[PDB]
Design a binder for this molecule. Structure first.
Ligand SMILES: O=C(Cc1cccc(Cl)c1)Nc1nncc2ccccc12
Ligand SMILES: O=C(Cc1cccc(Cl)c1)Nc1nncc2ccccc12
Lengths: 304, 304
């Protein structure tokens, strides 16, 4: 019992963190096999982050200009290349701590753990989600760039995010490990406003099921609804529309609790229309949307 | 920018987790040097958790009855002893992954990270606090016993908690690594109700300072208060009394923000007396009390 915002154990990823310095900029890199991945803005000075031509700036860089350090030991860079917004630094040594891994590009609504790092050293781990506007609400300071987001399935780390920047609003933007930004963001110091940060409905429903499993049941009502009626309410409250694909994904939680998905939707509709009335659900006074249905089952089943 | 419930990177502790089985009970153990620490209730059957005499039950156990497995490899037990509510199993092999470590007994209000484990394998990491009633609000299932709580200072892991049980209310109780329970709890399947779960005032104030540092400032008011006036309000709202020791600890955050501690107390008094009015602070609709002043500075400074 109990329900917490839980991150994956970070050990497998800690063993991959390295420091990358180019010129006067230092950030984090991810060392997998004989390649170090890092944001390409490591090559920029502050004076050219305003409008950088990365291909042109990269011409003035050689392998010896990329200083890569794993703990206190220096790695020898024998090649470099740019793939989208990331640099791939080939080193002469395979990381002996390389876990089984995959690079995945996640969809909005999916959650992941972040290992916030500075100077190639891990500071902390937390859980977050790819927002519907393609930002993440992380906790990152200067030097955190190159920290990564990931999920773990038994022994395989699926890396999904690499941090690149903070928007003027204090929300975060970055790429997958192929260097493609999530959303429309660009690695440049210019006006980039985020779109509507819509609530992830299927995750709210999953967390209401977690609340029932963990004994918080006051919000269950005598009502039901339809997908189309529920979606009228979701639109009004800046919630993502619920689809039959989302209903299907909530099947296991509906089976565990005996609460039909559309009945849980009617409970959520009443909470949206009436608020919490000063009450809490799983220690929160708001509807939590950064637990997926998979996260709830995993946490409520103890998958290792 | 951004502020998250952040746990310490769990790698150093993952390397210490082992599985301990005695009879038909399996739980987690912590392997440091040549000793494995685990809850003494590993020796109990369900039939004797009602009123166990641990010294008597332990007489029927020999070193070969304690099966200790680190990953897929078995450890040889060459000694065993009971220290308070923990068993210490001496093994013939020092854990090669033993980090620099200390055993500390924490005070209520202090936070720590938990690495929830099942079968000696880590499932997840989360942050929590020792509540003023000496329980923790964790996320633990059957088999999680022996999972540990810790803090990290650079390269030293200070272990502060070992999980032993869940109370009928779904809150958690356990010991320090010397086997002494936090609070009045006993390792027995009997009536153990928790006391008032009081809010940790100094942590709420620290988190209001984190909110100001991160730009959430709507709650700052034109008022001040005194410790004695503030404490009249704290009593009414089941908040811990604020002392000059707590004011002293909030000094660095007061200096960073330029907001005198007693002014922040007057802001907190107004939030207690008037509520949030449907507004949020750092993405929460309630006053968060599981960030210490040290956690706020650490997170807002990027200590690795
Ligand atoms: O935003 C940047 C640098 C940057 C600027 C413009 C474009 C690009 Cl690609 C990168 N880095 C940081 N990232 N996250 C949190 C930060 C908190 C404070 C200062 C810096 C932060
Ligand atoms: O409570 C116990 C076993 C136990 C019973 C009485 C006394 C003692 Cl010392 C230990 N273990 C568990 N711990 N945390 C969460 C749990 C969720 C479900 C089931 C079991 C859980």
């Amino acid at each position: 019992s109990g329900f917490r915002k839980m991150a994956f154990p970070s050990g497998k990823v800690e063993g991959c963190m390295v420091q990358v310095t180019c010129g006067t900029t230092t950030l984090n890199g991810l060392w997998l096999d004989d390649v170090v991945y890092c944001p390409r803005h490591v090559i920029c000075t502050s004076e050219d982050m305003l409008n950088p031509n990365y291909e042109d700036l990269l011409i003035r860089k050689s392998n010896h200009n990329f200083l890569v350090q794993a703990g206190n030991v220096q790695l020898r860079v024998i090649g470099h290349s740019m793939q989208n917004c990331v640099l791939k630094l080939k080193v002469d040594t395979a990381n002996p701590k390389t876990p089984k891994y995959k690079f995945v590009r996640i969809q909005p609504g999916q959650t992941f753990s972040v290992l916030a790092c500075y100077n190639g050293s891990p500071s902390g781990v937390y859980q977050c989600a790819m927002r519907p506007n393609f930002t993440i609400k992380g906790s990152f300071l200067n030097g955190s760039c190159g920290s990564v987001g990931f999920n773990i399935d038994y022994d395989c780390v699926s890396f999904c995010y690499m941090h690149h920047m903070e928007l003027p609003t204090g929300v975060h933007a970055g790429t997958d490990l192929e260097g493609n930004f999530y959303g429309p963001f660009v690695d440049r110091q210019t006006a980039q406003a985020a779109g509507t940060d819509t609530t992830i409905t299927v995750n709210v429903l999953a967390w209401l099921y977690a609340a029932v499993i963990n004994g918080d049941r006051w919000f269950l009502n005598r009502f039901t609804t339809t997908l189309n009626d529920f979606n009228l309410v979701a639109m009004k409250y800046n919630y993502e529309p619920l689809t039959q694909d989302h209903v299907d994904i909530l099947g296991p939680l509906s089976a565990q609790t005996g609460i039909a998905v559309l009945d849980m939707c009617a409970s959520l509709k009443e909470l949206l229309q009436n608020g919490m009335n000063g009450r809490t659900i799983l220690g929160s006074a708001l509807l939590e949307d950064e637990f997926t249905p998979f996260d709830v089952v995993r946490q409520c089943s103890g998958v290792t």
